[PDB]
């Protein structure tokens, strides 16, 4: 290409895009599949953490990380780079709690995270972010699901998807609008999340995966986010394997 236009983030192309921001989106694509599914009483987050060798320890490396005790966030792309947006995110979260003596509303968080990505494109001495971030929880207004782009664009979603196997996920999410125009209830959506990631793992097939599911649900996790583990997760695993077959 040349003539600027990607060589810095300040400079703009005559087309209406920035080709340096396009290679950041390519980095989200390369990362491991994450989905989030909005519900009429919660949110479910799932992630594919692939297993490359059996030298890893199972259920110990994940892309699910919590913010407060009731906002779940999960990231795809460059792994330490998604961690960092959560680490600053966590700092932003705390400030709001101290000052207003209230838990953060999810759309409030939504404004604040995307201001960090945007600051990293106003300066040619700051590399943008290259991570999408699926997020949401339960608050004052009930459950909300969002996703944020490494452009610094964000919008609300009923079903969201990102990563390498996102081509399958997107399709299963659509089947769901039709199947349930409530976007599915939060209990049955933990099982729906597992089945989705399995069709997505057909696009990564040459390797094994580890599935982590978490949730936050109004009255089936009690307004709080907690990790789906135990006999819960194994039921989710059994449903997925059955219906894929």
């Amino acid at each position: 290409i040349g003539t600027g236009y990607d060589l810095s983030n300040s400079v703009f192309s005559p087309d209406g895009r920035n080709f340096q921001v396009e290679y950041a989106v390519k980095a989200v694509e390369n990362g491991t599949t994450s989905i989030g599914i909005k519900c009429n009483d919660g949110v479910v987050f799932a992630v594919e953490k692939l297993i490359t060798s059996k030298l890893l320890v199972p259920q110990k490396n994940v892309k699910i990380q919590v913010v407060d005790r009731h906002i779940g966030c999960v990231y795809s792309g460059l792994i330490p780079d998604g961690r960092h947006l959560v680490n600053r995110g966590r700092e932003e979260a705390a400030s709001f709690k101290k000052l207003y003596k209230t838990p953060i509303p999810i759309p409030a968080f939504a404004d604040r995270l995307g201001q960090y990505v945007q600051a990293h494109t106003l300066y040619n001495s700051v590399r943008p972010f290259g991570v999408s971030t699926i997020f949401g929880g339960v608050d004052k207004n009930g459950a909300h699901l969002y996703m944020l782009e490494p452009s610094g664009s964000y919008w609300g979603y009923k079903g969201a998807a990102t990563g390498k196997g996102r081509q399958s996920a997107k399709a299963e999410l659509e089947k769901l609008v039709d199947h349930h125009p409530e976007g599915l209830s939060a209990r049955e959506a933990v099982k729906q999340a597992a089945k989705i990631i399995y069709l997505a793992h057909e696009d990564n097939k040459e390797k094994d995966f580890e599935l982590e599911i978490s949730w936050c649900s109004l009255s089936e996790t009690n307004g709080l986010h907690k990790f789906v583990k135990g006999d819960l997760l194994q039921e989710a695993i059994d449903f997925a394997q059955k219906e894929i077959n």
Partner: protein
């Protein structure tokens, strides 16, 4: 193009940076270490290097704490800035909270610190891998820290020159050393076998071995000379 071979603030068409990629190279030219762990112990075995036979060999084990410690493979200048930082955090946790810093928790602080230099246009980015051991409330853990900042919890891993044979020792014997607990002797012997294969066109010597061990019963101690000519 490779207009990106200079910019660390500007994405390469693949979605990487070349600088982060070259940093993996640095590890390859770097000196070999093999990690491994069990529930009640963790061991680092590292190769000392020399430039001649009037050299008294490079420390590859730095004591970070009396219960945590690290080894290196790659750039020694970059290894120094991060070692400083790392001791400052473990002492902080013992000062304010009378607390041991978890292996996993330490690693997340180091992560932000790698990516800060990636975000910036100022100072060198990192180019050393650290194999980290500790023993906290959650038993012994083994992290592989990368100069990207990616931190990976394994049962055994290796970085440095010709490190692909250490992964092959560890894969085969993965389960042997999960079953051994309470025997520091066994875990030490397993790294030594490991790093013979890793190396090619070299042999181990007494004073090339530096084995660093911490567990639940074993204090943080470094064995040299006659304390490592028992496992060669």
């Amino acid at each position: 193009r490779n207009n990106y071979d200079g910019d660390t603030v500007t994405f390469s068409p693949t979605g990487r940076l070349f600088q982060v990629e070259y940093a993996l190279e640095a590890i390859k030219q770097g000196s070999v270490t093999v990690g491994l762990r069990s529930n009640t112990h963790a061991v680092l075995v590292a190769l000392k290097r020399n430039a001649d036979e009037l050299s008294s060999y490079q420390k590859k084990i730095i004591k970070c704490d009396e219960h945590m410690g690290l080894s290196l493979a790659g750039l020694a200048p970059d290894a120094r800035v991060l070692s400083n930082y790392l001791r400052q955090q473990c002492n902080y946790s013992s000062l304010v909270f009378n607390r041991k810093l978890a292996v996993e928790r330490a690693g997340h602080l180091l992560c932000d610190k790698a990516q800060k230099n990636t975000q910036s246009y100022g100072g060198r980015p990192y180019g050393v891998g650290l194999l980290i051991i500790g023993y906290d409330k959650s038993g012994a853990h083994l992290l592989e820290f990368q100069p990207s900042g990616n931190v990976t919890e394994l049962y055994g891993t290796a970085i440095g020159a010709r490190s692909q044979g250490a992964k092959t020792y560890l894969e085969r014997t993965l389960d042997t050393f999960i079953k051994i607990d309470g025997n520091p002797d066994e875990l030490i012997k397993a790294g030594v076998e490991a790093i013979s294969q890793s190396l090619r066109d070299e042999s181990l010597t007494v004073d090339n071995l530096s084995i660093a061990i911490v567990g639940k019963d074993t204090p943080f101690t470094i064995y040299d000379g006659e304390a490592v000519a028992k496992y060669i």
